[PDB]
Amino acid sequence: HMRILFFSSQAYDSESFQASNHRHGFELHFQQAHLQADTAVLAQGFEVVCAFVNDDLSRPVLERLAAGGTRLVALRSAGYNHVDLAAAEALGLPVVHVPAYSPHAVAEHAVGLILTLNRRLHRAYNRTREGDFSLHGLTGFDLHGKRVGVIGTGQIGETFARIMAGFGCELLAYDPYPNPRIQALGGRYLALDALLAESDIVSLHCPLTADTRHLIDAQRLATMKPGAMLINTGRGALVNAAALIEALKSGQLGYLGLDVYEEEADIFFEDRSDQPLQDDVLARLLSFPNVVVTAHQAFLTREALAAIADTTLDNIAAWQDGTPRNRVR
Amino acid sequence: HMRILFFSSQAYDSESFQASNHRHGFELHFQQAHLQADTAVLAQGFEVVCAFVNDDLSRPVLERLAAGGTRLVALRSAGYNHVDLAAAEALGLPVVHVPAYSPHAVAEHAVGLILTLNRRLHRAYNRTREGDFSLHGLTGFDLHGKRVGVIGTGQIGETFARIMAGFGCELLAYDPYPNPRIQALGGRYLALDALLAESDIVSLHCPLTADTRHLIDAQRLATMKPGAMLINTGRGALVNAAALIEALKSGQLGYLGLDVYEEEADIFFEDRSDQPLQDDVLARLLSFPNVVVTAHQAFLTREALAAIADTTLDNIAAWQDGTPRNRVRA
Amino acid sequence: HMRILFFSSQAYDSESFQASNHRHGFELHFQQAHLQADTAVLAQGFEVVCAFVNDDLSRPVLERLAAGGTRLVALRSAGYNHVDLAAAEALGLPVVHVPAYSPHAVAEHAVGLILTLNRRLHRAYNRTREGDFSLHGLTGFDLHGKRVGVIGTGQIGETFARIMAGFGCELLAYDPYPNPRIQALGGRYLALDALLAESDIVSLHCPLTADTRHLIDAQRLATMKPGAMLINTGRGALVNAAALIEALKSGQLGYLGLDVYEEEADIFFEDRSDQPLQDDVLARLLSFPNVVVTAHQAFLTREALAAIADTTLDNIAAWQDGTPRNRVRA
Amino acid sequence: KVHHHMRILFFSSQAYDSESFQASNHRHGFELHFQQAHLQADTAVLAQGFEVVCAFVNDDLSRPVLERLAAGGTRLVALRSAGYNHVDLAAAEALGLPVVHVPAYSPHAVAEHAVGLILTLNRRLHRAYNRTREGDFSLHGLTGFDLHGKRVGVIGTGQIGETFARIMAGFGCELLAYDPYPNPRIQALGGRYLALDALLAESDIVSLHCPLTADTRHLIDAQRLATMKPGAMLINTGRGALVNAAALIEALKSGQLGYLGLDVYEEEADIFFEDRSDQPLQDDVLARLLSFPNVVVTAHQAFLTREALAAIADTTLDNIAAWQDGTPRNRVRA
Numbered sequence A: 001h002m003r004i005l006f007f008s009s010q011a012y013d014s015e016s017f018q019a020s021n022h023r024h025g026f027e028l029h030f031q032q033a034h035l036q037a038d039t040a041v042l043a044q045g046f047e048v049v050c051a052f053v054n055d056d057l058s059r060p061v062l063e064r065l066a067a068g069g070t071r072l073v074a075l076r077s078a079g080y081n082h083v084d085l086a087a088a089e090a091l092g093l094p095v096v097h098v099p100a101y102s103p104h105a106v107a108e109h110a111v112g113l114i115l116t117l118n119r120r121l122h123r124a125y126n127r128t129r130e131g132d133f134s135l136h137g138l139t140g141f142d143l144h145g146k147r148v149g150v151i152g153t154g155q156i157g158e159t160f161a162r163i164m165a166g167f168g169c170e171l172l173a174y175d176p177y178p179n180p181r182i183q184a185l186g187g188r189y190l191a192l193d194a195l196l197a198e199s200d201i202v203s204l205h206c207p208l209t210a211d212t213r214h215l216i217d218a219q220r221l222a223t224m225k226p227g228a229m230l231i232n233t234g235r236g237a238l239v240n241a242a243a244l245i246e247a248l249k250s251g252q253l254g255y256l257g258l259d260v261y262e263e264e265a266d267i268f269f270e271d272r273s274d275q276p277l278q279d280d281v282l283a284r285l286l287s288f289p290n291v292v293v294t295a296h297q298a299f300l301t302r303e304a305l306a307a308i309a310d311t312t313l314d315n316i317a318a319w320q321d322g323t324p325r326n327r328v329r
Numbered sequence B, C: 001h002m003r004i005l006f007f008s009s010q011a012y013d014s015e016s017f018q019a020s021n022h023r024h025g026f027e028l029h030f031q032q033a034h035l036q037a038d039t040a041v042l043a044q045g046f047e048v049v050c051a052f053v054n055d056d057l058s059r060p061v062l063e064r065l066a067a068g069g070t071r072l073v074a075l076r077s078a079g080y081n082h083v084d085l086a087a088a089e090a091l092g093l094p095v096v097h098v099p100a101y102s103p104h105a106v107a108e109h110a111v112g113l114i115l116t117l118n119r120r121l122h123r124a125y126n127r128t129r130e131g132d133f134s135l136h137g138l139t140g141f142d143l144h145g146k147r148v149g150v151i152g153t154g155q156i157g158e159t160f161a162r163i164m165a166g167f168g169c170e171l172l173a174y175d176p177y178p179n180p181r182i183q184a185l186g187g188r189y190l191a192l193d194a195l196l197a198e199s200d201i202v203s204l205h206c207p208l209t210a211d212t213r214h215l216i217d218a219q220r221l222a223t224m225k226p227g228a229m230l231i232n233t234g235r236g237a238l239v240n241a242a243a244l245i246e247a248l249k250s251g252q253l254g255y256l257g258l259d260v261y262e263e264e265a266d267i268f269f270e271d272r273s274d275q276p277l278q279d280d281v282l283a284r285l286l287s288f289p290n291v292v293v294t295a296h297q298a299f300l301t302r303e304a305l306a307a308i309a310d311t312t313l314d315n316i317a318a319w320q321d322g323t324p325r326n327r328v329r330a
Numbered sequence D: 001k002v003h004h005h006m007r008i009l010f011f012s013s014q015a016y017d018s019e020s021f022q023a024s025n026h027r028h029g030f031e032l033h034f035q036q037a038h039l040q041a042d043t044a045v046l047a048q049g050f051e052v053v054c055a056f057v058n059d060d061l062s063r064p065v066l067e068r069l070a071a072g073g074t075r076l077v078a079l080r081s082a083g084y085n086h087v088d089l090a091a092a093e094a095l096g097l098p099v100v101h102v103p104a105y106s107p108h109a110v111a112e113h114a115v116g117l118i119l120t121l122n123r124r125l126h127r128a129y130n131r132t133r134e135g136d137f138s139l140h141g142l143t144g145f146d147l148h149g150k151r152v153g154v155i156g157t158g159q160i161g162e163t164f165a166r167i168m169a170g171f172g173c174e175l176l177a178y179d180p181y182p183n184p185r186i187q188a189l190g191g192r193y194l195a196l197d198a199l200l201a202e203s204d205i206v207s208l209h210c211p212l213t214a215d216t217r218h219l220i221d222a223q224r225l226a227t228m229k230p231g232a233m234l235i236n237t238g239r240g241a242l243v244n245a246a247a248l249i250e251a252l253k254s255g256q257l258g259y260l261g262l263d264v265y266e267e268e269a270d271i272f273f274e275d276r277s278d279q280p281l282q283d284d285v286l287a288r289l290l291s292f293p294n295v296v297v298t299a300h301q302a303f304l305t306r307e308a309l310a311a312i313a314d315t316t317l318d319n320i321a322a323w324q325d326g327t328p329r330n331r332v333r334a
């Protein structure tokens, strides 16, 4: 019955969704192109559109989709800052998402970035691979005993905090809604500025909203402990990357791990190595020995993908039965 | 200025030891060469020799050292499988070590290898560096819920077990002397073969002895779960690397992280990139997308190095006060 | 509106062929799969099949193609060792090729491999990229004055010779046939074993036939000048790659540049980086600092591709008109 | 009755320097001291008491350095290099400090390297190597072009530029040339002299082989890049300051410049010849140049061949012996 058009489709998306669809028999169409004003016409006549985090679901796109017959927007993601939710509501277009496919996948990836940066595992790998077994510049630091500041102690942030507590770190936390689980781990809540000044490692797990946009700016970087590590597996626009470059150059910021980037939408998820990279700031970030960028793969585990696909297909079935689930606000 | 000769010296060694020697004023000499039968003559007239894990302290070397006037052997390491302890004892040469400079350094490195392999971070890095933001082949797996088998639950193995429990892993353990802290974490002890057959990830933290040599061989790899991950931050000779190659090629072994290698002694710690690598087995291990080798750097953190230098210099001061500590015995 | 089925099609092939002005109203179909016994059925009802150098055109494949209605085999290549020519002839299936799309493209690539190996440019690139501006191991040698031995002085060999003469190299040559252009360049013909013993650099440009198969074997490697450079942009089976590995490890062979490899057929032209590489010998060749392998891209220039497409489309038109051109004969 | 004292301090010394110079010194027995640091105002004191100082291309031999060296007893400055833009020759002369150099150790070593950069860029050999090393045997993005038939413009047809031109003519390239002082050997070769702007507009590949002087400084600037053929290749094995690298970045990003090979960089002096991989790179412009797939940078190694090194060492030790006997050779003058 039901027909679903997926934008920004990759092979991992079709594999996982085709496996999960043995339980549903929806008719699945995978389109590679990003959703934007000039591709929305591809969804003409599709009742359901399945979008990912760098699809453009601003007002003009939503208007096109609604006018073309689309009646549900299914986000195969937890995040939803790319959707104009007020406009969806005005158009009577429900928006559904997958709020907790695997908080562990994302938290673990953040911990992986930390360790790769700390022990210079990315540099080591390239050395041993060519028969360079020298260790200059690879000396790391013990995680045990360090102060780890978590900004945003929700599903992912809390899971990240628990892992880091298991390394014997001292947890510092900031959230407008503190939670008791963090305290039970030994964490202590404090104000943002104090967290920044006291943390050896900071990790961002708050959503992107008007209040978190450029939360990490020049001013705030200058507050941080010299040589600190910053991890961003949240959203690119949580940080001002031009300011990160200056702090990296001065040594003020010791390490940076990114799984997201502010201008990632038209570059991530494809191989653009054959052409010059246009984004000056990203190119410069990539040049540093103490920066690691992964291309928005913190979600990318077998279990995460299976849960995304199962929950998304269930969301759609629930909507089709008139009892929708996992709606976004 | 008591005189200490350091073999296999690297810049990080002379830097850390020099900083720590502000509190002692020993006279420190750093030799780059490895200690072996051929190089032992360099220690003539040195009362104290400081060696590392790839120096050869077998009987013939210890005999030369003793004949040349050396009276103490200070290991700037926790491990001591490179020392013939019976022969040291017969010669009246005490051997001292640093047993617990930082169990966390080594455990954390093992967990780093696990995550790099899992999320293919070493491959991702190289891709994004050149503007390849594609994700094919990089899908990993949640650590939460997996079974992690720890072989050797001592200072490092236990610290590793604790970290992995914090990711929500199910801990399985094998040690001739089980310890209660592991059970308090939720770990369950079992026999070696059962641990191998049931684990998704296996990590080696037992010392190298005649009983652990080639513990992971062809037969034991075949009993492991298909696609499992094996981590070796112990010693090279705990595994048979030729058998690892065959299991990697078949897919039987899904991942391998090594910080040690059986024939590392004359290879590691130096940049040999300008010449062909002679060792066929290491070259082949290095060829795989699901193998990561680090060059015996699990011990290499600021805190580990400072503790190694401080404890080693203190060990030597204690010896020279007639109250030796951190001795290793036959 | 004759239809053409292309096997082993890559994006650069379909772009190339579609952008030609020489379509002659043909209908072009591009299949990615390699031609072999179990894919030949895809050509059922196609009058013309276009194949590349790693397609299987042995007798059983040719029999299927003829039984399925294919009447012409068009090689988008110069080389034809992959074709059983006697069997094609017995089936009345003409085979056409492109013998001289661009001898310069291929010769220039060989020269590129030479310079890369000499100046260690592949190593330098990765160093500078990460801010390593050190030069240890990168010292090269002046080409000017060196002896360059060319095995096979045909279209590509003589173009290569000509380029190497322009660097002021001394040219040595071996071919069953004299070529007066080689003498005009200053080249001297000599016997194979003498060429091998006297040359600083050797480059292979003979076709693969039963007489050139494994021309470079253990015994002939041992005759070469110690530390010499060997370049192979001919065909993989001209050399014995297991013997190349031993000579590289001993230092007897100083450098190796390959654009071709004996078991390339099912490996080259794809990205196989996500899985272990099965071929031990290729994995080991890839491990060396003084080996460069490119994946059969010597033909791969803008001008070469355009000529291959134009000449191949013309060859097919000329066959259709009953005046065939560029036939290869048993 | 037959021959059977002299102390030399080398700045910016590397292992390949002490090895080559020690081999050549079997013929002399001078006393050789190798210092790693770069020569500049605050390291000049290390040459106190040394009659001879041997410097390389990134040592600072401006007036204030030369004044310290002279005051400290140094009597000869021996450049282990062909180039000399780093020396204030008028100041050396005013101080009575002769400066000697090695003008032609191996013009082939440098020309050949430039050709290597061309071919690596053209066939993407650097990209292919990293692919095949990890089992990626795909060829997308690696299509090159035939050199045969292309136009190659040589700016500066001296020893190196002429050797380069001859090599490129052997590939069947058409040679275009610009030099304020044309020479007949290039024409005899089939090369055609023309004005700079016309060379820039007509060339598929341009290679710089002029010295750095006040007239060649930023010779390749934004305006001259905009004159070039779209998608052209530029090669710089001359000096860093011959080009404006910020403008090269904009032309690379637009596609106006198709390829860039550098063996030299304007701010190289305090970074090249060292492994600086363990720290951030401070220079924004170099970091960005390094990011591109169609840029290759080698760290000033065009001179670096066995034969070049042996000639530099032999000629440099000979220049010092000749000076010591009062009959100096290979002097450079203001």
Ligand SMILES: NC(=O)C1=CN([C@@H]2O[C@H](COP(=O)(O)OP(=O)(O)OC[C@H]3O[C@@H](n4cnc5c(N)ncnc54)[C@H](O)[C@@H]3O)[C@@H](O)[C@H]2O)C=CC1
Pocket (backbone or CB within 6 Å): A078, A079, A080, A099, A106, A151, A152, A153, A154, A155, A156, A157, A174, A175, A176, A177, A205, A206, A207, A208, A211, A212, A233, A234, A235, A259, A260, A296, A297, A298, A299, A300
């Ligand atoms: N890189 C990746 O692949 C993925 C990234 N993400 C990002 O992670 C974010 C977090 O996801 P969850 O933890 O699941 O969400 P959640 O809703 O469980 O938790 C978010 C937390 O952030 C806090 N928060 C809100 N505003 C804040 C502010 N101004 N300052 C500090 N904290 C604030 C909330 O109070 C809440 O505790 C998502 O918004 C998404 O952008 C999510 C999934 C994958």
Ligand SMILES: NC(=O)C1=CN([C@@H]2O[C@H](COP(=O)(O)OP(=O)(O)OC[C@H]3O[C@@H](n4cnc5c(N)ncnc54)[C@H](O)[C@@H]3O)[C@@H](O)[C@H]2O)C=CC1
Pocket (backbone or CB within 6 Å): B078, B079, B080, B099, B106, B151, B152, B153, B154, B155, B156, B157, B174, B175, B176, B177, B205, B206, B207, B208, B211, B212, B233, B234, B235, B259, B260, B296, B297, B298, B299, B300
């Ligand atoms: N990669 C690196 O840089 C470093 C490696 N190591 C290695 O790790 C090893 C372990 O270190 P620690 O935890 O400090 O030692 P430990 O002595 O504290 O603990 C070792 C554990 O191994 C167990 N064990 C002994 N024999 C066994 C057997 N046959 N089978 C299974 N388990 C057995 C012991 O009962 C003990 O619980 C060292 O012996 C050394 O080789 C140590 C430091 C650094």
Ligand SMILES: NC(=O)C1=CN([C@@H]2O[C@H](COP(=O)(O)OP(=O)(O)OC[C@H]3O[C@@H](n4cnc5c(N)ncnc54)[C@H](O)[C@@H]3O)[C@@H](O)[C@H]2O)C=CC1
Pocket (backbone or CB within 6 Å): C078, C079, C080, C099, C103, C106, C151, C152, C153, C154, C155, C156, C157, C174, C175, C176, C177, C205, C206, C207, C208, C211, C212, C233, C234, C235, C259, C260, C296, C297, C298, C299, C300
């Ligand atoms: N890497 C690549 O992409 C390419 C490789 N090739 C290979 O290069 C080969 C050469 O092609 P061309 O120069 O065009 O061919 P060609 O036919 O013009 O010249 C071949 C020469 O090799 C000589 N030769 C034949 N048998 C010989 C033997 N037994 N020993 C020594 N020399 C012998 C012939 O006398 C002739 O002079 C092709 O057969 C092909 O395999 C060709 C094009 C591209």
Ligand SMILES: NC(=O)C1=CN([C@@H]2O[C@H](COP(=O)(O)OP(=O)(O)OC[C@H]3O[C@@H](n4cnc5c(N)ncnc54)[C@H](O)[C@@H]3O)[C@@H](O)[C@H]2O)C=CC1
Pocket (backbone or CB within 6 Å): D082, D083, D084, D103, D110, D155, D156, D157, D158, D159, D160, D161, D178, D179, D180, D181, D209, D210, D211, D212, D215, D216, D237, D238, D239, D263, D264, D300, D301, D302, D303, D304
């Ligand atoms: N990358 C490297 O490792 C090396 C670089 N070089 C550089 O290459 C340069 C060339 O050296 P050689 O060819 O031996 O010098 P050379 O003196 O023989 O020739 C230089 C040529 O440039 C020409 N020229 C002078 N002023 C010019 C101007 N304003 N515009 C255009 N052309 C002009 C000259 O007339 C002469 O024909 C050296 O000055 C040096 O900076 C030299 C050696 C090694």
